[PDB]
Amino acid sequence: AAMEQFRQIGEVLGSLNALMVLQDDILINQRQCCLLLELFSLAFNTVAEEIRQNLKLEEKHTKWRALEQPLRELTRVFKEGELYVKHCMDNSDWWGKVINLHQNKDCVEFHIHNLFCYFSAVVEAIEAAGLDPSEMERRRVVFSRKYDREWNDPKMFQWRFGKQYLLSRICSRFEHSWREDRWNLVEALQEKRKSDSKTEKRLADLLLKKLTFNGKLFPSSILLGSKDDLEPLSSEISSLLALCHSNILQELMHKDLQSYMKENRYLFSIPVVIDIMLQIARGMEYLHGNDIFHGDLNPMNIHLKERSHTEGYFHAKICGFGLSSVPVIWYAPEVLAEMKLTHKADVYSFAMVCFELITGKVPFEMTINIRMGERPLFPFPSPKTLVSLIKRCWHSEPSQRPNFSSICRILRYIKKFLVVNPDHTPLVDCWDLEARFLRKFPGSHTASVNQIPFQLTSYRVLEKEK
Amino acid sequence: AAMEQFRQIGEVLGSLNALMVLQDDILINQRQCCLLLELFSLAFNTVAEEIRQNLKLEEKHTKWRALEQPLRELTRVFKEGELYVKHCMDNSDWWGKVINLHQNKDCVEFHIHNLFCYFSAVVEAIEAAGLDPSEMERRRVVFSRKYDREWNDPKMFQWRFGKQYLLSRICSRFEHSWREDRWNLVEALQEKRKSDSKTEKRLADLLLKKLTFNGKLFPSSILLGSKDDLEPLSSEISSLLALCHSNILQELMHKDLQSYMKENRYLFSIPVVIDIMLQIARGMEYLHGNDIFHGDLNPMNIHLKERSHTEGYFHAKICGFGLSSVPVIWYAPEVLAEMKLTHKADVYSFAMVCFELITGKVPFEMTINIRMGERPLFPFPSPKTLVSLIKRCWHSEPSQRPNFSSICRILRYIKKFLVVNPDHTPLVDCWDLEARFLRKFPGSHTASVNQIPFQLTSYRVLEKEK
Amino acid sequence: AAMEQFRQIGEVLGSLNALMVLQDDILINQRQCCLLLELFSLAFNTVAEEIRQNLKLEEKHTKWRALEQPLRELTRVFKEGELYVKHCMDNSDWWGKVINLHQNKDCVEFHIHNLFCYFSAVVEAIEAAGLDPSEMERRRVVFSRKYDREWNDPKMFQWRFGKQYLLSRICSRFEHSWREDRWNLVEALQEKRKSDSKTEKRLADLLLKKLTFNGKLFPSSILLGSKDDLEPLSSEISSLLALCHSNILQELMHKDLQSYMKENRYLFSIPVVIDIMLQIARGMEYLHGNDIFHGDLNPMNIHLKERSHTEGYFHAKICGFGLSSVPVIWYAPEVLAEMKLTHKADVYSFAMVCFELITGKVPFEMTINIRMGERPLFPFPSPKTLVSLIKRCWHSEPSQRPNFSSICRILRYIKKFLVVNPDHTPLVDCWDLEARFLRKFPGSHTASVNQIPFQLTSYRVLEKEK
Amino acid sequence: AAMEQFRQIGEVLGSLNALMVLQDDILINQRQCCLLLELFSLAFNTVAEEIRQNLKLEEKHTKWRALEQPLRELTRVFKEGELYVKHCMDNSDWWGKVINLHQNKDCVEFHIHNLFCYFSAVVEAIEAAGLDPSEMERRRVVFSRKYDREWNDPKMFQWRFGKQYLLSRICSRFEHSWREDRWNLVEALQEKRKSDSKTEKRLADLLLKKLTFNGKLFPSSILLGSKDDLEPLSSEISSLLALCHSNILQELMHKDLQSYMKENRYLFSIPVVIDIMLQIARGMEYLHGNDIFHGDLNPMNIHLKERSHTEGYFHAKICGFGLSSVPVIWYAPEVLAEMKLTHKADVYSFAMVCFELITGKVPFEMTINIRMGERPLFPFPSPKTLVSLIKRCWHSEPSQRPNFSSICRILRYIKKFLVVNPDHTPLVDCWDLEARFLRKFPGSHTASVNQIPFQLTSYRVLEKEK
């Protein structure tokens, strides 16, 4: 039930607030998770406010039916966030907790990332207008002018709708949180190491130095080894230690993708297939945030996991990109020419990975044909939206295949469209719309979460213009 | 789990707040239920604050175990309150909703009554002290002085602990709420009747007049009669219309007690038996709040119900007290002398009713013996606390049996003691303690909910003195 | 200084809040003045917010210069409100305080009335745009579309700008405040009269009955008479007791107008002249709110006063309208025909009164000429805006002269225009603009303060269309 | 007037809040001054709350007279704080503003230091009890038990009164503020230097490095010299750069003391004399916070200033302590033995300085006599409290003269006593009381502002025991 789903948001947010009110016991977050609490409270309050202002609270079972899917996805993301706060509140091996936790976590930004990617289902809250016969027209034209061509700009948007889509002037707050946690952590570490009163202190010093290169000093971590790096060269390749993102195994992957594939008979919905694609992308171009190139990408290198209380949703990272010291059908066509670590080239692998996910079948029932450009074809059952995006990347020229920034946002747009329509036409081929946003407005090596409300809207605006 | 129970409070309160944020659609409350939301938020916030201040958030599974039962009862009462808010938010027969709802409801005060009767399980939050060895003594003596003999006074208490036990200077707020609802209601009724545009309006006028005697004008209520008052005399007996309390069927009783008895083999725990007793008392002396005397009380006149999401708890009212126009073993011994509507006499019936509830067996396997004073005796299995209270009332002299005020509060004290100790000695015979509070401090025709924090504490103070 | 004026708002509001935090001692308001505190805090917070959002806090002395006059008038009204709260907080003759105070006060609504009439100098806060050269155009066109022809509607406005111009859904809150004060008052009166323990109680009963006709029972008010009603007939003429407004002497007028005139050599600025006119109008048509007609209006019947900390501003009421039991140059031309208590006729007197105020000279250096329609002419020094309004009313036909509703709002529009422009062309003759608002939208026996934001805006919108 | 003084607090706090609501324009504070706003709002709210709870708002002119002096001093400190926020909000030479401002400012902690030193005039708010005759005794004994001997402990106090004397668990908040300002500053500096687009950037790099030793690189600061360090040795003596306190000229002293003396005929009240003493002490032992010893102290080295809107109050620093590369009557008696940079020795100079301040006359109308121990004697007019403290320090043994920690707090106790009693016996010689606090509880190289509520109370407790 629609309104009932809202009460679920209330329940989850109350749970979060109850857990958080006993705050000062945390020694890692309480400056990250506090941001989560504030953002979630703001989101709930603003969706409640806009409901109260633009709906009428009598037709609880007749003319709210459109609200179901978006609010359900919202309870999912809220639940996901609360569970992260829980795992950060656990009392389990404080030292191992420090290690596993944020030196390089950013799970808070990942969660708010999903929150943003789905909050733009405020477009639902706008379906209340669709009592008074003349009024309906007023609301329609109001929203129409809210979607006018002259409204496409970071400044103009961020000023005319900042408070409707959660953007304050606390856009820069996220980074301050990412910082004060660090200093509380090092203060606690110094307190521990100098107020020690075996070998725990030694780690602290090694650990404290990292937050102050490549320490990697001692086997002091005796490393009691369960089931399952050769020379002191390429030391500078240890920067890896400064590539933090919740889509990159900085610690351990539960299982990989190719493993999860061969016994997969469909387990991936268009609504987890698209997601499984995005967590890669959202995480991919952060590599280019330091210009590092994965080079070889394969389902043997994408470590998925389980999303807890979700309908099969998984959080995936990417492993093996680092470590450049030591079948080819997963290589790029241009990297067939060895007879190739272009930023552009990696898309062929990304596309190739998605090729499996959609179909669930590995490419081919030949290498020379790949250079020519002939490519395997997906089945009739596969949907129109997914197929168009992969094929465009599929083209042989390396420049004509789109970068990750040019491919992440368009995926998340598909997400918003799906969440808006539980049933099943897609608007248009997605690629054409992106070019517009890419075409003029563009001119961005890395993108942060603040841009999501704008990017999501621009397509809504751009799409109307056609 | 203790802390887990708290998260349940968070969930319930979030549910309530989500339902309430869509407020203005209500046409009966939104000045009563708003009081509920404010009080519940204050209760949650203050228990959270005192937890954060007097506990330490690491021993989540070791030294909080004492918190379980009180917080569980708290989630019960919170749940009960949310469900009332729901029933008031329902969209079902707005006119019948107006009738059934508050002209004489007071369900808000009944709910806050239970909330007060159980919040004094803040004494649990004081068990955190029972890390630092010297500190434990400090907290013990602090609480000891919090329980000093020189602290027994409405003013001194209400000033030195008002904010710890929820009492503001919004003690008088409750009545203002009970009022503004009325005026919003009559304003909506006038709007409806004068903006009518069959016979709905006629009711309004009759209904509006009541809130402006005995209208009872017409059979305009055609009264489509399901399964199942003789002359125009004793018109003044219609005051009944001004006796409002959520423990008195002002509209219909689902089932009575004697009905629920004969097939009852125990269904009543000491923790619902005591409660079933109290809802009577809490509701009994409100009759004396207008000096009306029930006279004849029998399980054939106590209409119990179901408490929804509770462990068999029921909300009961009293029916047949009014209507004075038209076996004796349920009569008082002094009203054996007919060969008798004393306020004192009714206790014999109340006691007699409780006599069944404890034992579950009707008195006797004789009337002359009752005048003499011989009385039936309860079995060995029955607990010590319940037996002492009934027997004292049982005594033949009508003056030596205690009034309802003198018997309600002592029952609720047993409630607090039980909630504090899930296992199973009782402190002392309860009657001795009441006499002390009754003995000097007393000097009270009616009592309101504000007095509950004080009354509950006084026994804790009085009991220590012994 | 512009920003400095804002700090003055801060100072005044802090003063108000400090006085109000010691609230419960008040026995008349604390439900009226509390509304004042809430409204003023909201006004300050929202002007601060919109400043922070649409200005840049560096050009504190260069590009804020336009903000001076509106914010200065704002500190005036805030100061006026605080002083009212003071007079209500005074400890002076609690009984006389009750009498003089709200049985029929409405000073709270009068204050918020001025607050609304001047807050629409938010148009100033919009002058910040007038750093980035392209941006200025964006803000200009944004505001332009904020002033589009398709935006003229109570619903559409009250929904699309309610929070920018203070209108909540607490528009109806004002009346609830006007009510709960009454009931706190009667509760205190009952407490006093029944807990009396000479003749003070007798008044209470007489006073309590009025709030429960024409009591006017006894000379119990011995009436110790200072310097300075004949028979028991026309009893029904005592309704006067139900005509409450802060522009009508319900208790005593310090001085009248004609008195203040002959020695007045200009004391009335266009900015107090217009105001002196409005307080009449705002107060005039409330008479028609019960259809009562003043009939004869003269500067010998307008009791002005002093506005405390203001630049000569005065609060005026109207006396002698009631009492219908027992030179003509102040009579209407049609009431020359006696050889006449039309609602329309009174305008001639109102206009005639304004005729003095502008010029400061009584009409004429003749009665037959007045019937013909010849009228005295104001001097060249008098401004264009004031002259156009009086002359239109001046016309002989009684129907073609505008009603008070049709003349109050247009005056207050002149107020907003003046406050917006300290220097000195007027936009257009004011009368033409009103006809538009009057022409279709109209279809209003009485108007309340909630309509002011809309009415003020409509002219801004209507004026652009021309 | 007492209550009127409160309204002044309201005015000042409103001024502060109005200035602060336009926050993000600040590029130095907005993490320091924000702490000021929060603390001041908390202080105002809590004094208002305790007034409302323990006073009665009718005797506004009779039984509040005791509140005058403490609340007046409070408006002073609030005003002082607002003016600091102003100077930090000024738009004057952003670069010079950065230099002069907090690299080593701590003015926020200095202001809150005065706020704490005077808030313990909450003891006034306790004078309301001194209507009901029996009640007065209740309040007296309540406060008595609030001052029981068993209550002397950091934990017990900080837990049983933390919220009454402003101490949260935001005691550690102060340091976080002192930090985030730094990082916002370096972020803005990096933004400026890398987005430069003459020689301003060079400074930034030098400046940025300091916040990352002794740079002191270039005369790039051309140093346009007004009216009015020899070799590259003792480089390590540049630590001075890490000795930050608002009582130590880190930049320029307006005037010194000896200058201000010879024409001073009294200008120093016991209420600015004591203060002038304290700002030294509060600032003195921070030198021992890095063990540095001033060695030679003279009115030729104490640079006083003007306290703006205060009654002659001045903020003084200490200059010349650093720079150890290159009449004796101001030297310590033991440093007469040269025929001496003890931490103990400096007191003789401090005492000697105070000796002037009290009397206003330099010591003597002889050196050999000083070794013997004969000392100049102050006049009969000088008060008893000041004389006892200086004389004890005056004793010849260097160990028997008290350290700064042992002498700062006792001075501030005199402050509280004076503020509590505008008229004029002192309680006892102050020195005896300190020994008690010093005697057991002590066991503190440096003390921070958090300790002030406790230290101030302990004397109140200790003094009662006698």
Residue boundaries of the structural domains of chain B = 2-177, 241-465
User: Residues of A with CB below 8 A from B44's CB?
Assistant: 18
| Among the partner residues C24, C169, C180, nearest to B176 by beta-carbon distance | C180
Residue B228 CA neighbour count, 13 Å, CB half: 3
On whether any CB of chain B is under 8 Å from the CB of D138, the answer is yes
Q: How many CB pairs under 8 A join A and B?
A: 74
Which residues from chain D sit within 8 angstroms of residue C17, using beta carbons? 10, 14
Instruction: Report how far apart, in Å, the C-alpha atoms of D41 and of each of A242, C423, D19 are.
Output: 42, 40, 14
Q: Which of B249, B332, B346, B333 is nearest to B291 (CA)?
A: B346
Instruction: Decide if D160 and B142 are in contact by the 8 Å CB cutoff.
Output: yes
Residue A247: how many other CB atoms lie within 10 Å:
20
Dist. CA D427–CA D410, nearest whole Å: 13
What region does C68 belong to: left with phi over 0, alpha with psi -120 to 50, or beta? alpha
With an 8 Å Cβ cutoff, are C176 and B180 in contact?
Answer: yes
CA distances B36 to B77, B78, B79, B109, C222, Å, are 12, 10, 12, 9, 49
* Tokens linked to A336: 């067939």
Do residues A447 and A283 make contact, with C-beta atoms less than 8 angstroms apart? no
Residue by residue, DSSP assigns B260-281 as HHTT------HHHHHHHHHHHH
| Neighbour subunits, C (≥3 Cβ pairs < 8 A) | A, B, D
Subunit contact B24:C169, Cβ cutoff 8 A: yes
CB B384 within 8 A of CB B426: yes
D180 touches chain A (CB under 8 A): yes
How many angstroms separate the CA atoms of B97 and B88, rounded? 8
Closest CA to D355 of D370, D343, D372: D370
CB proximity D179 to A under 8 Å: yes
B241-465 has which fold? Transferase(Phosphotransferase); domain 1 (1.10.510)
> Taking Cα atoms as reference points, which of A329, A330, A332 lies closest to residue A340?
A332
* Structure-token pair, residue D234: 């003792």
B-chain CB neighbours of C24 within 8 Å are 169
Is D155 near chain B, with CB under 8 Å?
Answer: yes
| Amino acid (one-letter) located at B311 | E
Which residue from C140, D26, C132 is spatially nearest to A155, judged by alpha carbons?
Answer: C132
In angstroms, the Cα distances linking B421 to B65, B416, B418, B427, D265 are 12, 9, 5, 11, 75
Contact indicator for D425, D385 with CB cutoff of 8 Å: no
CATH code: domain C247-465 is 1.10.510.10
C-alpha–C-alpha distance, residues B165 and C14, integer Å: 31
Q: What is the largest CA-CA distance in chain A?
A: 77
Under 8 Å between Cβ of C26 and C89: yes
Q: Would an 8 Å CB–CB cutoff place C173 in contact with chain B? A: no
State the nearest Cα–Cα gap between D99 and chain A, in angstroms.
Answer: 23
CA of residue B7 relative to chain centroid, distance: 26
For D455-459, the CB contacts below 8 A with 24+ separation are D455/D409, D455/D412, D455/D413, D456/D116, D456/D117, D456/D120, D456/D409, D456/D412, D456/D413, D456/D416, D457/D120, D457/D157, D457/D161, D457/D165, D458/D152, D459/D410, D459/D413, D459/D433, D459/D434
**Among the four given CATH numbers 1.10.510.10, 3.40.50.10470, 3.20.20.150, 3.30.70.260, the one describing domain A243-465:** 1.10.510.10
C-alpha dist (Å) from residue D213 to D63, D238, D289, D291, D325: 60, 7, 19, 18, 17
Centre a 10 Å sphere on the Cβ of residue D166 and count the other Cβ atoms it contains: 22
Q: Chain C contacts of A159, Cβ < 8 Å? A: 53
Measure the CA–CA gap between A110 and A174, rounded to whole angstroms. 11
By the 10 Å C-beta count (0-12 exposed, 13-18 middle, 19+ buried), C254 is classed as: exposed
Give D17's contacts in chain C (Cβ within 8 Å). 10, 14
Phi first, then psi: give them for residue B317, nearest 5 degrees: -120, -175
Interface test with A, best of D171, D179, D181, D190 (most A CBs within 10 A): D179
CA A192 to CA A196: how far, in whole Å?
5
Q: Which helix (H) or strand (E) holds D200?
A: helix D200-210
Residue A52: Cβ within 10 Å count: 16
Q: Which of A69, A424, A391 is nearest to A269 (CA)?
A: A424
CB of C321 closer than 8 Å to CB of C87: no
Nearest residue in chain D measured CA to CA from A177: D180
Question: If you count DSSP H runs as helices and E runs as strands, how many of each does chain A have, helices first?
Answer: 17, 2
Query: Contact, D48 vs C18, CB < 8 A?
Result: yes
Report CB contact under 8 Å: C138, A156: yes
C318 beta partners: C302
Find chain D residues with C-beta within 8 A of B150's C-beta.
141
Task: Write down the experimental method used for this entry.
Answer: cryo-EM
* Contact with chain C for residue B229, Cβ under 8 A: no
Of C465, C359, C362, C347, the C-alpha closest to C411 is C347
* Chain B hits for A25, Cβ within 8 Å: 56-58
Q: How do beta strands C302-303 and C317-318 pair? A: antiparallel
Residue whose C-alpha is closest to residue A156's, from C145, B402, D127? C145
- Residue D144's H or E segment, with its range, is helix D133-146
**Parallel/antiparallel/unpaired status of strands A317-318 and B302-303:** unpaired
C-alpha atoms less than 13 angstroms from C-alpha of B165 in its C-beta half-sphere: 25
Inter-chain CB proximity D22 and C51 less than 8 Å? yes
- CA B220 from centroid of its chain's CA atoms: 36
3-state secondary structure of C439: helix
- Distance from the D420 Cα atom to the nearest Cα atom in chain B, whole angstroms: 25
Side chain identity, residue A380 = F
Q: Pull the structure tokens for residue B196.
A: 């009518």
Neighbours of B320 (CB within 10 A): 15
Which class is domain D248-465? mainly alpha
Chain A CB contacts of B94 below 8 Å = none
Backbone angles phi, psi at B318, to 5 degrees: -125, 125
DSSP3 helix / strand / coil % (chain A, rounded to 5): 55, 0, 45
**Pairwise CA distance, residues A351 & A277, whole Å:** 9
Residues D235 and D213: their CA atoms lie apart, in Å, by: 8
Query: Residue A350 in contact with residue A402, Cβ under 8 Å?
Result: no
- The two tokens of residue A391 are 């094929």
Q: What is chain D's alpha carbon radius of gyration, rounded to the nearest angstrom? A: 24
The pair of structure tokens assigned to D343 is 């931490």
- CA torsion through residues B400, B406, B411, B414, sign: negative
How many Cα atoms within 13 Å fall on the side-chain side of residue B446? 13
The continuous run of DSSP H or E covering D19 comes out as helix D2-20
Q: C-alpha angle with apex A337: A335 to A339, nearest 5 degrees?
A: 125
Q: CB within 8 A of C253, min separation 6: which ones?
A: C303, C304, C305, C317, C319
CB atoms under 10 Å from CB of D298, counted, come to 19
Q: Please check whether residue A11 touches C, CB under 8 A.
A: no
The residues, ordered by sequence, that sit 6+ positions from D336 with a Cβ below 8 Å of its Cβ are: D328, D367, D370, D371
Confirm or reject contact between A24 and chain D (CB < 8 A). Answer: yes
Using alpha carbons only, give the angle B149, B154, B159 rounded to the nearest 5 degrees: 90
| CA–CA gap between residue D423 and residue D416 (Å, rounded) | 13
In whole angstroms, what is the distance from residue B411 CA to residue B417 CA? 10
Q: Is the dihedral of CA C67, C73, C76, C77 positive or negative?
A: negative
Considering only CB atoms, which chain D residues are within 8 Å of B138?
153, 155-156
Q: Which residues of A touch C132 (CB under 8 A)?
A: 155
Q: Chain A residues with CB inside 8 Å of D169's CB? A: 24
Give chain D's largest Cα–Cα span: 77
Which helix (DSSP H) or strand (DSSP E) does residue B317 occupy?
A: strand B317-318
What separation, in Å, do the N-terminal and C-terminal C-alpha atoms of chain D show? Answer: 35
Residue D21 is given by DSSP the state T
Alpha carbon distance C319, C287 (integer Å): 12
| B173 interfaces chain C, CB cutoff of 8 Å | no
Which residues precede chain breaks (C–N over 2.5 Å) in chain D?
A: 130, 169, 197, 212, 228, 250, 264, 326, 339, 365, 424, 443
Contact C25/D56, CB-based, under 8 Å? yes
Structure tokens at B173: 């707020």
Q: Which residues pair with D345 in a beta bridge?
A: none
Tokens of B92: 């079902």
D143 three-class SS: helix
Q: Does C386 touch chain D (CB under 8 A)?
A: no
Inter-chain CB proximity A141 and C160 less than 8 Å = no
Beta carbons of C19 and D12 less than 8 Å apart? no
The dihedral region occupied by A379, where left means phi > 0, alpha psi between -120 and 50, and beta the remainder, is beta
Pick from B445, B416, B452, B438: which is nearest to B171 by CA?
B452
Read off the tokens for B213. 């005697």
What contacts 24+ positions apart, CB below 8 Å, involve C381-388?
C382/C358, C383/C270, C383/C426, C384/C426, C385/C270, C385/C414, C385/C426, C385/C430, C386/C270, C386/C273, C386/C274, C386/C354, C386/C358, C386/C414, C387/C358, C388/C429, C388/C430, C388/C431
Cβ-nearest to C91 among D19, D51, D58:
D58
Query: Is A374 within 8 Å of chain C by CB?
Result: no
Q: How many CB atoms lie within 10 A of CB D269?
A: 13
Please indicate if any CB of chain B lies within 8 Å of the CB of C183: yes
- Residues 6+ positions from B245 with CB-CB distance below 8 Å: B104, B106, B110, B283, B286
Contact between B295 and B341 (Cβ < 8 Å): yes
D263 touches chain C (CB under 8 A): no
Longest dimension (CA), chain C: 77
Q: Look-up: residue for tokens 């607030």?
A: A17
Instruction: Say if CB C174 and CB C109 are below 8 A apart.
Output: yes
DSSP assigned state of D329: G
Strands (E) across C10-71 are located at none
Pairing, β D317-318 against β A302-303? unpaired
Classify residue A66 by its DSSP letter: G
Q: In whole angstroms, what is the distance from residue D376 CA to residue A165 CA?
A: 75
Query: Three-state DSSP class for B318?
Result: strand
Chain B neighbors (3+ CB pairs < 8 Å) = A, C, D
And the tokens for C189?
A: 């009166």
> Could D176 and A180 be called an inter-chain contact, meaning their C-beta atoms sit closer than 8 Å?
yes
Q: Which residues of C touch B179 (CB under 8 A)?
A: 183
Is the sign of the CA dihedral C211, C214, C219, C225 positive or negative?
positive
C240: phi then psi, degrees, rounded to nearest 5? -20, -35
Closest CA to D3 of D58, D49, D50, D53: D58
Q: Considering only alpha carbons, which residue of chain B is nearest residue C168?
A: B24
CA-to-CA separations, B235 to B173, B288, C271, D220, in angstroms, rounded? 35, 20, 66, 103
| Binary contact (A18, B6; C-beta < 8 A) | yes
Cβ contact D17:D42 at 8 Å: no
Q: Using the Cα atoms of residue B421, residue B427, residue B433 and residue B437 in order, give the sign of their dihedral.
A: negative
